[PDB]
Every structure is written in C-alpha cells, then in structure tokens.
Short mmCIF file of C-alpha atoms in Angstrom, two decimals:
data_model
loop_
_atom_site.label_atom_id
_atom_site.label_comp_id
_atom_site.label_asym_id
_atom_site.label_seq_id
_atom_site.Cartn_x
_atom_site.Cartn_y
_atom_site.Cartn_z
CA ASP A 1 53.00 121.64 79.40
CA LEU A 2 51.32 119.40 76.93
CA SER A 3 52.61 115.85 76.58
CA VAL A 4 50.40 113.95 78.99
CA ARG A 5 48.08 116.84 79.89
CA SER A 6 44.40 116.80 79.12
CA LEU A 7 42.31 119.74 80.20
CA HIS A 8 39.21 119.32 82.35
CA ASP A 9 38.80 122.73 83.99
CA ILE A 10 38.17 124.79 80.85
CA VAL A 11 35.14 122.67 79.63
CA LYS A 12 32.22 124.16 77.89
CA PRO A 13 29.11 122.59 76.21
CA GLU A 14 29.91 123.92 72.69
CA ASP A 15 33.75 124.00 72.65
CA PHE A 16 33.37 120.42 73.79
CA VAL A 17 30.52 118.46 72.27
CA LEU A 18 29.64 114.89 72.88
CA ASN A 19 26.14 114.26 73.87
CA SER A 20 25.11 111.50 71.44
CA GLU A 21 28.05 110.02 69.64
CA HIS A 22 28.06 111.64 66.15
CA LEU A 23 30.21 114.54 67.05
CA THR A 24 33.34 114.28 69.24
CA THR A 25 36.18 116.63 70.01
CA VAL A 26 39.85 116.10 69.47
CA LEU A 27 42.39 118.43 70.96
CA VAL A 28 45.50 119.30 69.29
CA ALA A 29 48.68 120.44 70.94
CA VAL A 30 50.32 122.69 68.46
CA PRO A 31 53.81 124.47 68.81
CA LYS A 32 53.51 128.40 68.62
CA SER A 33 55.04 128.61 65.15
CA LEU A 34 52.67 126.03 64.01
CA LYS A 35 49.59 128.00 65.37
CA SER A 36 48.90 129.64 61.95
CA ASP A 37 49.62 126.39 60.27
CA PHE A 38 46.83 124.67 62.30
CA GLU A 39 44.21 127.51 61.64
CA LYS A 40 44.80 127.02 57.95
CA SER A 41 44.96 123.17 58.04
CA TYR A 42 42.23 122.16 60.40
CA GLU A 43 39.49 121.55 57.86
CA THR A 44 41.72 119.51 55.44
CA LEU A 45 42.98 116.90 58.10
CA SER A 46 39.92 114.70 57.48
CA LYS A 47 36.58 115.05 55.72
CA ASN A 48 33.56 116.30 57.84
CA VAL A 49 35.50 118.67 60.11
CA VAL A 50 33.16 121.19 61.78
CA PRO A 51 33.54 124.87 60.59
CA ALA A 52 35.35 127.45 62.60
CA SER A 53 35.95 125.22 65.58
CA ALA A 54 39.69 125.99 65.57
CA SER A 55 40.17 128.41 68.45
CA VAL A 56 42.85 128.48 71.23
CA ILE A 57 40.91 127.50 74.39
CA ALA A 58 44.13 127.65 76.35
CA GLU A 59 47.59 128.79 75.54
CA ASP A 60 50.99 128.27 77.25
CA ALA A 61 54.52 129.47 76.47
CA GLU A 62 55.79 126.47 74.35
CA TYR A 63 52.37 125.39 72.94
CA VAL A 64 48.87 126.61 71.96
CA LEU A 65 46.07 124.22 72.69
CA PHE A 66 43.27 123.92 70.15
CA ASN A 67 39.84 122.30 69.99
CA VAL A 68 38.35 120.96 66.75
CA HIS A 69 35.04 119.09 66.41
CA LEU A 70 34.53 116.44 63.98
CA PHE A 71 32.75 113.12 63.26
CA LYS A 72 33.91 110.03 65.21
CA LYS A 73 34.98 107.79 62.31
CA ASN A 74 37.02 110.54 60.96
CA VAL A 75 39.06 110.96 64.25
CA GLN A 76 41.57 108.28 63.08
CA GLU A 77 42.20 110.14 59.72
CA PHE A 78 42.37 113.48 61.65
CA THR A 79 45.02 112.29 64.09
CA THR A 80 47.37 110.73 61.55
CA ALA A 81 46.99 113.79 59.27
CA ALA A 82 47.81 115.98 62.31
CA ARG A 83 51.06 114.13 63.03
CA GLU A 84 52.36 114.64 59.37
CA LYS A 85 51.90 118.36 59.75
CA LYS A 86 54.09 117.91 62.85
CA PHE A 87 51.49 118.70 65.50
CA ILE A 88 50.91 116.42 68.46
CA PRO A 89 47.32 115.36 69.23
CA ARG A 90 46.26 115.11 72.85
CA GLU A 91 43.12 112.85 73.04
CA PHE A 92 40.40 113.97 75.40
CA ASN A 93 36.64 113.47 74.89
CA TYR A 94 33.91 115.17 76.82
CA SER A 95 32.61 112.03 78.57
CA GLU A 96 31.29 113.22 81.87
CA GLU A 97 33.20 110.70 84.08
CA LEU A 98 36.56 111.72 82.42
CA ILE A 99 36.18 115.40 83.17
CA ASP A 100 35.16 114.66 86.74
CA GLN A 101 37.94 112.15 87.55
CA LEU A 102 40.90 114.27 86.35
CA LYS A 103 39.53 117.22 88.34
CA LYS A 104 39.17 114.92 91.30
CA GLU A 105 42.83 113.79 91.01
CA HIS A 106 44.10 117.39 91.42
CA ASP A 107 41.89 117.94 94.49
CA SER A 108 42.51 114.60 96.13
CA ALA A 109 46.24 115.01 95.71
CA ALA A 110 46.12 118.58 97.36
CA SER A 111 44.03 117.31 100.26
CA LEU A 112 46.47 114.31 100.91
CA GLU A 113 49.66 116.55 101.02
CA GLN A 114 47.77 119.13 103.15
CA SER A 115 46.43 116.91 105.93
CA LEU A 116 49.67 115.00 106.10
CA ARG A 117 51.97 118.01 106.39
CA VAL A 118 50.01 119.34 109.41
CA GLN A 119 50.13 115.93 111.23
CA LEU A 120 53.80 115.41 110.17
CA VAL A 121 55.08 118.84 111.43
CA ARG A 122 53.16 118.23 114.70
CA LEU A 123 54.51 114.56 114.97
CA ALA A 124 58.14 115.51 114.64
CA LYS A 125 57.96 118.22 117.27
CA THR A 126 56.23 115.78 119.63
CA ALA A 127 58.81 113.16 118.71
CA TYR A 128 61.72 115.58 119.15
CA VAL A 129 61.00 116.20 122.95
CA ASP A 130 60.59 112.55 123.71
CA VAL A 131 63.84 111.50 122.07
CA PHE A 132 65.54 114.49 123.84
CA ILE A 133 64.38 113.21 127.44
CA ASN A 134 65.43 109.68 126.36
CA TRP A 135 68.93 110.70 125.05
CA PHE A 136 69.81 112.25 128.45
CA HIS A 137 68.38 109.27 130.35
CA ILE A 138 70.98 107.05 128.66
CA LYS A 139 73.87 109.45 129.25
CA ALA A 140 72.96 109.83 132.90
CA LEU A 141 72.83 106.04 133.15
CA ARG A 142 75.93 105.65 131.08
CA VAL A 143 77.98 108.00 133.14
CA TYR A 144 76.78 106.59 136.38
CA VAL A 145 77.56 102.93 135.53
CA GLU A 146 80.96 103.89 134.05
CA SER A 147 81.87 105.85 137.26
CA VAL A 148 81.22 102.64 139.25
CA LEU A 149 83.47 100.69 136.80
CA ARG A 150 86.37 103.13 136.88
CA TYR A 151 86.57 104.63 140.53
CA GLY A 152 84.92 101.72 142.44
CA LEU A 153 83.53 102.80 145.76
CA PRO A 154 82.01 105.16 146.99
CA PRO A 155 78.80 104.54 145.06
CA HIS A 156 77.85 108.08 146.07
CA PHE A 157 79.48 110.46 143.50
CA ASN A 158 79.52 114.28 143.14
CA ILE A 159 77.90 114.89 139.68
CA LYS A 160 77.45 118.15 137.70
CA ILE A 161 76.43 119.47 134.27
CA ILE A 162 78.62 122.45 133.36
CA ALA A 163 77.38 124.76 130.65
CA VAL A 164 80.36 125.87 128.51
CA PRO A 165 79.97 128.91 126.38
CA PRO A 166 80.53 128.03 122.58
CA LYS A 167 84.23 127.52 121.59
CA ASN A 168 85.75 127.25 125.10
CA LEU A 169 85.20 123.51 125.22
CA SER A 170 88.81 122.54 124.45
CA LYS A 171 90.13 124.93 127.13
CA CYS A 172 87.57 123.63 129.66
CA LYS A 173 88.25 119.90 128.93
CA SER A 174 92.11 120.36 129.53
CA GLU A 175 91.70 122.02 132.98
CA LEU A 176 89.50 119.30 134.19
CA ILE A 177 92.02 116.66 132.97
CA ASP A 178 94.90 118.26 134.89
CA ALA A 179 93.09 118.45 138.24
CA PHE A 180 91.09 115.32 138.46
CA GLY A 181 93.14 113.03 136.09
CA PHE A 182 95.45 111.67 138.73
CA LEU A 183 92.49 109.81 140.35
CA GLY A 184 91.80 107.41 137.50
CA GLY A 185 95.44 107.02 136.47
CA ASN A 186 98.83 108.35 137.39
CA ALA A 187 100.28 107.03 134.21
CA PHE A 188 97.17 106.33 132.21
CA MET A 189 96.74 109.98 131.70
CA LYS A 190 97.72 112.37 128.92
CA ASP A 191 96.59 115.85 128.01
CA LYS A 192 93.68 115.98 125.47
CA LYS A 193 91.16 118.50 124.23
CA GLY A 194 87.85 118.86 122.32
CA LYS A 195 85.81 116.19 120.56
CA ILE A 196 86.53 114.98 117.08
CA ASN A 197 84.13 112.42 115.46
CA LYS A 198 85.54 109.95 112.85
CA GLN A 199 85.33 106.72 110.95
CA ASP A 200 89.00 107.08 109.92
CA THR A 201 89.96 105.42 113.23
CA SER A 202 88.04 104.32 116.32
CA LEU A 203 90.45 106.13 118.61
CA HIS A 204 89.03 109.22 120.08
CA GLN A 205 85.49 108.17 120.31
CA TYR A 206 85.29 107.75 124.09
CA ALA A 207 83.39 104.54 124.32
CA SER A 208 83.39 101.25 126.16
CA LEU A 209 82.34 98.93 123.31
CA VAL A 210 85.04 99.92 120.76
CA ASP A 211 88.67 100.75 121.49
CA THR A 212 89.21 104.40 122.08
CA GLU A 213 91.70 106.61 123.73
CA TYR A 214 91.31 106.24 127.55
CA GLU A 215 90.22 109.47 129.28
CA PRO A 216 91.87 110.07 132.69
CA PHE A 217 88.55 110.46 134.49
CA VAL A 218 84.96 110.16 133.41
CA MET A 219 84.04 112.99 131.13
CA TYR A 220 81.51 113.02 128.33
CA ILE A 221 81.15 115.86 125.81
CA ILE A 222 77.60 116.89 124.61
CA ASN A 223 77.27 118.98 121.45
CA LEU A 224 74.12 120.71 120.62
CA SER B 1 31.48 131.70 63.89
CA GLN B 2 32.11 128.96 66.53
CA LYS B 3 28.74 128.78 68.18
CA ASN B 4 27.12 129.20 64.50
CA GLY B 5 28.71 125.93 63.16
CA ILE B 6 28.16 123.98 66.38
CA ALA B 7 24.50 124.93 66.48
CA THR B 8 23.35 123.85 62.98
CA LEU B 9 25.11 120.58 63.67
CA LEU B 10 23.62 120.07 67.14
CA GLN B 11 20.20 120.51 65.74
CA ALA B 12 21.00 117.81 63.15
CA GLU B 13 22.46 115.50 65.77
CA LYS B 14 19.38 115.33 67.95
CA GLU B 15 17.17 114.77 64.80
CA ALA B 16 19.64 112.12 63.57
CA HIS B 17 19.74 110.23 66.92
CA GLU B 18 15.91 110.27 67.13
CA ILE B 19 15.66 108.47 63.66
CA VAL B 20 17.99 105.86 64.95
CA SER B 21 15.77 105.57 68.10
CA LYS B 22 12.68 105.04 65.85
CA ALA B 23 14.31 102.04 64.11
CA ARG B 24 15.04 100.35 67.48
CA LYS B 25 11.44 100.88 68.40
CA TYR B 26 10.41 99.18 65.20
CA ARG B 27 12.82 96.38 65.83
CA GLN B 28 11.50 95.76 69.36
CA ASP B 29 7.87 95.75 68.19
CA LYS B 30 8.73 93.19 65.31
CA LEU B 31 10.13 90.76 67.85
CA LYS B 32 6.85 91.07 69.90
CA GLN B 33 4.87 90.75 66.64
CA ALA B 34 6.61 87.47 65.99
CA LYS B 35 5.21 85.87 69.14
CA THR B 36 1.71 87.38 68.64
CA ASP B 37 1.31 86.37 65.04
CA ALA B 38 2.79 82.82 65.93
CA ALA B 39 0.43 82.49 68.79
CA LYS B 40 -2.50 83.16 66.56
CA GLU B 41 -1.63 80.24 64.17
CA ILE B 42 -1.02 77.67 66.88
CA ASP B 43 -4.42 77.92 68.57
CA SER B 44 -6.27 77.61 65.13
CA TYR B 45 -4.18 74.59 64.32
CA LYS B 46 -5.09 73.07 67.66
CA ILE B 47 -8.89 73.07 67.23
CA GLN B 48 -8.37 71.91 63.69
CA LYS B 49 -6.78 68.64 64.99
CA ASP B 50 -9.47 68.41 67.55
CA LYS B 51 -12.17 68.78 64.88
CA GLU B 52 -10.91 65.74 62.90
CA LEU B 53 -10.52 63.81 66.14
CA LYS B 54 -14.03 64.48 67.35
CA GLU B 55 -15.21 63.20 63.93
CA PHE B 56 -13.04 60.15 64.44
CA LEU C 1 39.30 130.38 58.34
CA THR C 2 37.61 132.54 55.69
CA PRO C 3 33.60 132.78 55.48
CA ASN C 4 33.24 131.02 52.22
CA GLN C 5 35.00 127.89 53.47
CA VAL C 6 33.09 127.70 56.76
CA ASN C 7 29.61 127.66 54.95
CA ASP C 8 31.06 125.05 52.50
CA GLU C 9 31.98 122.81 55.37
CA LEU C 10 28.65 123.47 57.11
CA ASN C 11 26.47 122.01 54.37
CA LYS C 12 28.85 119.05 53.99
CA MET C 13 28.85 118.05 57.72
CA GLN C 14 25.13 117.98 58.36
CA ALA C 15 24.72 115.92 55.09
CA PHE C 16 26.89 113.16 56.73
CA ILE C 17 25.10 113.37 60.15
CA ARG C 18 21.72 112.52 58.79
CA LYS C 19 22.89 110.05 56.16
CA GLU C 20 24.72 107.97 58.80
CA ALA C 21 21.55 107.86 60.95
CA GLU C 22 19.36 106.98 57.99
CA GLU C 23 21.76 104.16 56.85
CA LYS C 24 21.92 102.74 60.35
CA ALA C 25 18.20 102.93 60.90
CA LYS C 26 17.74 101.05 57.53
CA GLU C 27 19.91 98.03 58.64
CA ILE C 28 18.10 98.05 61.99
CA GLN C 29 14.57 97.90 60.55
CA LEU C 30 15.63 95.40 57.83
CA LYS C 31 16.87 93.00 60.42
CA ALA C 32 13.65 93.47 62.15
CA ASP C 33 11.83 91.99 59.07
CA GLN C 34 14.12 88.99 59.17
CA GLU C 35 13.78 88.31 62.89
CA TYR C 36 10.04 88.54 62.82
CA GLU C 37 9.85 85.75 60.17
CA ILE C 38 12.36 83.28 61.56
CA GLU C 39 11.18 83.51 65.13
CA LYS C 40 7.43 83.51 64.02
CA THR C 41 8.04 80.16 61.97
CA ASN C 42 9.96 78.70 64.99
CA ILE C 43 7.25 79.47 67.49
CA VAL C 44 4.65 77.84 65.12
CA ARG C 45 6.77 74.84 64.04
CA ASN C 46 7.76 73.95 67.61
CA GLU C 47 4.14 73.88 69.00
CA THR C 48 2.52 72.35 65.84
CA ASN C 49 4.92 69.42 66.51
CA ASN C 50 3.55 69.15 70.09
CA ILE C 51 -0.08 69.26 68.86
CA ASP C 52 0.66 66.49 66.27
#
C-alpha cells in the first residue's frame, strides 16, 4: 500500500534516472480510476516533463504506481499540480544510498526476527524444565515443613504421590478426608472436595500465609 | 517510447554537465593566474627600488 | 500519450538541459574574471607595501 512506501527493489537505470542532477524522478501514487487521468495529465503538471515516461512500474489493488522523469526545479510545480488532480506523490529519488538502505531495512528486520525466534523457542523449553524441577522442590519442602507443624512427631512420615485419572479428583479427595481426617482434628474436620481457585474470597485456597479453610490432614492438589 | 525519450535526454545531460565542468576548470586556472601574474609584478618592482637605491 | 506530443516534449526538454548548463557556466567563468583581478591587485599591493 502506498502512503509511506517507496520502492527500491524495482529500480532500473532508465525508469529511474539521476546520475548528474539535471534529471530526477518523481513517483506518483495514483488511485486506479485516476490511472487514465495520470497518463493524459503527466506532461501538463509542469513544464519540461520527459516524454512517454508515464508507465506503471508496479501496480497494487487500490493504487497504480507511476514513474515520471522531469527537471529538478520543476519537481515543486509537478508535485503541487499532482495534488490538485487528486493524486498523491510519493517522493523517491534514485540516489544510490537511498535504494540500498531501504533494501537493507527489509533484510535486517527479517534476520533479527529469525535469529531471535530460534533462540527464544529454545530458551523457553530450557526454561520450562528448570521451573518444573523447582516448582516440585518447593511443594516437597512445603508439605514436609507443614506436616511437622500439624502432626508434630514423628519426623519420619509416610509420603506418596498418587496419580488420579482426570475428573476423579473430587471423589479421591473425599475418601482420603474420611479416613485420615480424624488425626489432625476430631472436630476441626468437615467433608470437602476438589480445588476451586478464587479472588472472590481467600477461603478455599489451602495456604498458611492467608486465611483459608482448614483441611483435616495435609493434602495438596496439583493440576496440570 | 520510454527508452527513446530517456536516451536523447541522457546524451544531452552528459554534454551539459561537461560544459559546466569546463567553466570550473576555467575558474580554478584564473585563481592560479592571479598569483602568477601578481608574482611577476612584485619582483620587477623590487629591483626597480633597488636600482634607485644603488644610485643613491 | 500520442506520438505527436512526445516529439513536441522531446525538443523542448533538451533545449532546457543545455541552456541551464550554458547559463551556469557563464556565471562561473564571469566570476572567474572578477576573482583574478581582485586577488591579483591584492597580492601586488600587499608586497609592494613591504618593498616600500
């Protein structure tokens, strides 16, 4: 789309002339309707407009992109005259450094996104494992210390990880509560199930830093 | 007709630019000329003072 | 555009190209006449004052 775009990959030595300074090239972004209107008008926009220069070097859906060659002084008259007709000039000259730098910007931008994406996909996967080993280290620690706080002695505990098949968690949690619950409270015990996460209330979050609903024995629920 | 119009004009442009180049050439030589033709009057003027001194 | 108009613009454009070059070249070599004289008188005047 033309509104900021200047071409730099469709250059040619004759559709784009600037080698001294007498001749220059102005590009004109012309709506499709207006394409005939430009082919007719191009010569009249200023005096000293080079003959038959008006050709569509590039074309898109909304716009057709023209080149016209003309004298440098006359470029001011040309541009203003172009805007009355209700075209929009896009200014690009054929200085060597211009052509090269825009081309470079496309390339340098593809190379930055490319390198980065490969390191970034790799970095997350490598990060993922480390934070996994670390998450379980805290839970193991957390559970151990808690056990000490709630049961007291012995410091030697019987500890298991039980794999529950998906959607049997609530039924599993209840059965454990009935059997073992008496140990940590014979009155501090109620039936409960599943794990609900909230910021409505702080109850039901099973934690020792904010007030929660007291579980009858140490049980922590891991959702993956 | 695109590379017909461009061509007539490119031939003109290189001939135009060369005329401009000739004038700068002329202009650089005139500035050298100034120093050369000033240097030639100073050393004639010098022995002229010396001549009327050696008479003195 | 049409072949008669493209030859009409072709003679007009190369008329300007040369004319601009010729005009510029004329200011350039005219100034050169002025600079030669001023600077030539200065170089003389300065050193003839030393000799005096």
